[PDB]
Design a protein around this ligand. Structure first.
Ligand SMILES: CCCCCCCC/C=C/CCCCCCCC(=O)O[C@H](COC(=O)CCCCCCCCCCC)COP(=O)(O)OCCN
Ligand SMILES: CCCCCCCC/C=C\CCCCCCCC(=O)O[C@H](COC(=O)CCCCCCCCCCC)COP(=O)(O)OCCN
Ligand code: HEM
Ligand code: HEM
Ligand SMILES: CCCCCCCCO[C@@H]1O[C@H](CO)[C@@H](O)[C@H](O)[C@H]1O
Ligand SMILES: CCCCCCCCO[C@@H]1O[C@H](CO)[C@@H](O)[C@H](O)[C@H]1O
Ligand SMILES: CCCCCCCCO[C@@H]1O[C@H](CO)[C@@H](O)[C@H](O)[C@H]1O
Ligand SMILES: [Ca+2]
Ligand SMILES: [Zn+2]
Length: 754
């Protein structure tokens, strides 16, 4: 019964938090805004069907518009937020209709006040799944309908391609998820719906389906009491647990303990370290991620450029033609997850034999096969997205094209091959680790924790399948976050962490006992806050008001594990020094230290800058999000993948040919460029955008007009300095990765024994 209490706590933590998530997931499904079978006029004339709404949404996904603009605050920022934009047109129309822009202030005052009392009342009948909206509202739906035809025909005057939506892209009828009916009448309908629920009070409630989001006086949308109350409450509870957790941490020495006495640093003679065929093979895996990282960055360089030159890349043409923003955005995200994720899969391949003590038969065969599987998935899924967004696909867009969800842009069949790949990956890990699991008595020991977490990789991605074109937006978004917030960060904050403990225990740098106890404490505080903390993504996506409290409180608690960081980085810096200038893993530790600090700064402080519900009310879907997004994503996960990538490359390259000079330069260039792009550009624009929404309405902050202000542009223009500096750091890595195959070692043992 070695770490019994810690296990109960962890198990209990996972059990309780999972329940709350599921219950809250149920409350959403049951309280989210409805998609009436028929929405119609006072004359009884139907204008909308649940099937239309589902269709509009479908074409929105079909054309990957979530990689251009947003809806309900989620998606890209080049374009506007259709919900807020559609809401304005619809609101403006209701004004004109009742206006029968020239009235007196004393006059426009009366009308705008009239449209307020009229549009915020729920006219949906639960007994009968049908909604009826006044004439003043139908006239508004018209302006909305007209507005977007113009848009999806003439363009939006900023980055969006002309007449991108065309019937010729899909069959006469019998269209996959989109309905038999004009496509750009469905979209306008989808947008109108999100705008409908964002401005209409919840039945019996006093605020709307989105807790009064977006901010917009003319529609009566203003900050809710819960948004302000939970801002204070969440932080007070955080203060309460910081003290509590700190005490627990201090009293049980729940951290790694050095395994060596003063001056007795362990010898790391890499020359006499067993190496195997599957490991050397996993070595080239890293050069590819290094390459994908290179392209991923490039697309980022392209996206940033488009904020200054909307329809061209320095006058050139094909670029905005074949690689427009939405498409480029998709690849940027897709490749980020791809290169970071597969860096750890490789790391898994690499240590697998070490855990077992030998090379599994056909390991190199399986490894090599896994290799050409992703390479296909990647090259393939991307081709798919191009064909899909462009229309050179039929009803195969959802299966092979662009699924239409930011972060989840690949097609369903592309997702299927993904899981099988991970499943295969899992098998490969298990094959090499299997015997370790057998030697390890304690079923909750290092190797078991390493294996349990390894399986969460493929498994947890399966929740994505609860998502498909006809799913209600807020409910589908609910599941999307299980992948973005729980999965990606489950790949990294659990699997990676146990992998590092394993490595440090192997190098004989920290006691094994010390390490597993530490992992238990972290996992419990990590899952104890983060599982429910997922809810801060549900503040305004249409979810019930209860998630404002749940999300605010639990995401705030996510900061606790983060503070036991700047000081963990130091313990690591410390042991890095205990190893002289001949310490083999310098480069690795510099990136390790870097991820801890960015975890405090990028996720901890920049993430919190936008976490308060009071703040997020205005900020949600603005530049501060990407500010935090890069600081955390690249700062934490990118650096971590790199640390592990260099760690493996070190056990593979011939020492004599190794030089971490270039890596020092990379580390410096990457860190400086990341901070610079955040601080010099993303942050100041984020503030302006939030101020602009606070004073004129959120619609004004998401209009291309905002991006056009000279002040914004200049801020946008100087992003090039730090962006170029960051770029240089990645090429230096790439160059070091590539010309690293030229100095590889060859397997020491085969299917033998270490
Ligand atoms: C909006 C603000 C966000 C700020 C986020 C900043 C993130 C902090 C970055 C930390 C990088 C840590 C890198 C490892 C540091 C520990 C090991 C180390 O520094 O050893 C250095 C070489 O290190 C190295 O060669 C490692 C490279 C160090 C490069 C640091 C550049 C980061 C600048 C961050 C501020 C813009 C040896 O020389 P010394 O000056 O004696 O080392 C002591 C200094 N730590
Ligand atoms: C909504 C979802 C939220 C996220 C939930 C998943 C999070 C995944 C990430 C990390 C999970 C780490 C889980 C570690 C739990 C360890 C519990 C445990 O081992 O307790 C053990 C028995 O374990 C056992 O006998 C086996 C039980 C533990 C392993 C079961 C499989 C778990 C894999 C789950 C991944 C999908 C008690 O007895 P032992 O000490 O092992 O045995 C005697 C030792 N002398
Ligand atoms: C030369 C460096 C880079 C540049 C110039 C850059 C630029 C950009 C731009 C312009 C966007 C637009 C988001 C939008 O308007 O919708 C973006 C989003 C994003 N980037 Fe990058 N990027 C760079 C590096 C990276 C790296 C290294 C990672 C991590 C592996 C990363 C992760 C992301 C993520 C997750 C988003 C989406 C966040 C959001 O939409 O709020 N980026 N980036
Ligand atoms: C290493 C850990 C973390 C990573 C990689 C990360 C990454 C990201 C990314 C990429 C986004 C943009 C999502 C999108 O495109 O819509 C985002 C949004 C967000 N993150 Fe994090 N995050 C981390 C930790 C945290 C923490 C600790 C907090 C709590 C303070 C937090 C709060 C938020 C919030 C509130 C948003 C939503 C912004 C909006 O709706 O406008 N994050 N995060
Ligand atoms: C979320 C925080 C969970 C904290 C769990 C602490 C479990 C402490 O457990 C205790 O650790 C002592 C050594 O420090 C041992 O001597 C005790 O026998 C053991 O019961
Ligand atoms: C600090 C965290 C406090 C969380 C309080 C959650 C209170 C949930 O309260 C429940 O909300 C449901 C809708 O989601 C309603 O249908 C239920 O009737 C209501 O009791
Ligand atoms: C993105 C640009 C990547 C450039 C990588 C250049 C890698 C050069 O690599 C070098 O090439 C030489 C022959 O020219 C060989 O003799 C060296 O052994 C080899 O390391
Ligand atoms: Ca986004
Ligand atoms: Zn989150």
């Amino acid at each position: 019964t070695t770490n019994s209490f810690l296990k109960s706590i962890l198990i209990f933590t996972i059990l309780i938090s999972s329940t709350v998530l599921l219950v809250g997931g149920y409350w959403i499904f049951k309280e989210m805004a409805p998609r009436p079978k028929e929405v119609r006029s006072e004359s009884g004339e139907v204008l909308m069907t649940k099937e239309t709404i589902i269709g509009g949404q479908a074409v929105f996904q079909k054309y990957g518009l979530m990689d251009y603009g947003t809806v309900l605050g989620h998606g890209s920022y080049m374009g506007p937020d259709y919900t807020a934009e559609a809401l304005k047109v619809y609101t403006e129309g209701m004004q004109d209709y009742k206006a029968k822009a020239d009235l007196t202030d004393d006059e426009k005052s009366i009308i705008r006040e009239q449209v307020i009392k009229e549009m915020r009342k729920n006219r949906y009948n639960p007994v009968t799944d049908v909604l009826v909206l006044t004439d003043a509202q139908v006239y508004g739906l018209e302006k909305v309908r007209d507005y977007y035809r113009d848009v999806f025909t003439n363009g939006d005057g900023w980055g969006l391609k002309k007449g991108l939506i065309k019937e010729s892209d899909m069959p006469k009828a019998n269209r996959a998820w989109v309905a038999d009916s004009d496509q750009i009448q469905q979209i306008a309908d989808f947008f109108f719906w999100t705008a409908w629920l964002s401005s209409t009070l919840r039945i019996g409630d006093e605020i709307t389906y989105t807790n009064n989001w977006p901010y917009y006086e003319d529609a009566g949308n203003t900050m809710s009491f819960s948004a302000v109350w939970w801002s204070g409450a969440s932080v007070t509870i955080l203060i309460l647990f910081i003290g509590i957790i700190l005490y627990v941490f201090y009293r049980y020495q729940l951290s790694m303990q050095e395994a060596y006495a003063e001056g007795k640093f362990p010898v790391i003679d890499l020359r006499r370290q067993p190496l195997t065929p599957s490991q050397v093979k996993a070595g080239k895996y890293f050069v590819v991620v290094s390459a994908l990282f290179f392209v991923q960055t490039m697309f980022g360089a392209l996206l940033a450029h488009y904020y200054t030159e909307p329809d061209s890349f320095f006058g050139i043409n094909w670029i905005y033609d074949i690689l427009p923003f939405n498409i480029a955005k998709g690849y940027h995200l897709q490749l980020a997850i791809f290169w970071i994720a597969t860096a750890w899969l490789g790391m898994g391949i690499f240590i697998a034999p070490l855990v077992g003590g030998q090379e599994p038969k056909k390991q190199g065969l399986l490894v090599d096969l896994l290799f050409w599987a992703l390479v296909v998935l990647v090259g393939g899924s991307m081709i798919g997205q191009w064909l899909g967004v462009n229309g050179y696909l039929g009803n195969e867009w959802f299966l092979l094209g662009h699924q239409g969800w930011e972060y989840i842009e690949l097609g369903r069949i592309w997702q299927i091959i993904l899981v099988v790949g991970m499943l295969l990956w899992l098998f490969i890990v298990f094959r090499g680790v299997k015997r370790g699991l057998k030697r390890e008595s304690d079923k909750g020991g290092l190797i078991h924790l390493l294996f349990y977490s390894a399986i969460a990789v493929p498994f947890f991605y399966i929740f994505a399948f609860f998502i498909q074109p006809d799913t209600n937006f807020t409910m589908a978004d609910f599941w999307r976050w299980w992948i973005i917030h729980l999965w990606v960060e489950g790949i990294f904050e659990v699997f990676a962490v146990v992998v590092i403990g394993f490595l440090l225990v192997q190098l004989r740098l920290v006691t094994k006992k010390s390490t597993v106890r530490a992992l238990y404490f972290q996992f419990t505080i990590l899952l104890g806050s983060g599982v429910i903390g997922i809810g801060h993504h549900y503040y305004y996506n249409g979810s019930p008001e209860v998630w404002i409290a749940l999300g605010a409180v639990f995401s705030a608690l996510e900061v606790i594990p983060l503070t036991l960081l700047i000081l963990e980085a130091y313990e690591q810096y410390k042991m890095m020094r205990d190893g002289g200038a001949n310490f083999p893993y310098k480069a690795t530790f510099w990136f390790l230290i870097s991820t801890a600090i960015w975890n405090l700064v990028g996720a901890g402080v920049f993430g919190f800058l936008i976490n308060l519900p009071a703040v997020s009310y205005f900020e949600h879907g603005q530049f501060l999000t990407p500010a935090h997004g890069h600081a955390a994503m690249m700062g934490v996960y990118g650096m971590f993948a790199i640390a592990v990538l260099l760690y493996s490359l070190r056990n593979i390259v011939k020492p004599e040919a190794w030089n971490d000079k270039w890596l020092k330069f990379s580390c410096w260039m990457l860190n400086i460029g990341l901070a610079g792009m955040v601080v010099i550009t993303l942050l100041p624009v984020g503030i302006l955008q939030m101020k602009e929404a606070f004073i004129h309405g959120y619609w004004a902050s998401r209009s291309p007009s905002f991006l056009q202000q000279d002040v914004v542009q200049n801020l946008l223009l100087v992003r090039a300095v730090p962006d170029t500096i960051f770029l240089i750091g990645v090429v230096a890595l790439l160059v070091f990765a590539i010309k690293a195959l030229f100095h590889l070692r060859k397997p020491t043992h085969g299917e033998g024994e270490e």
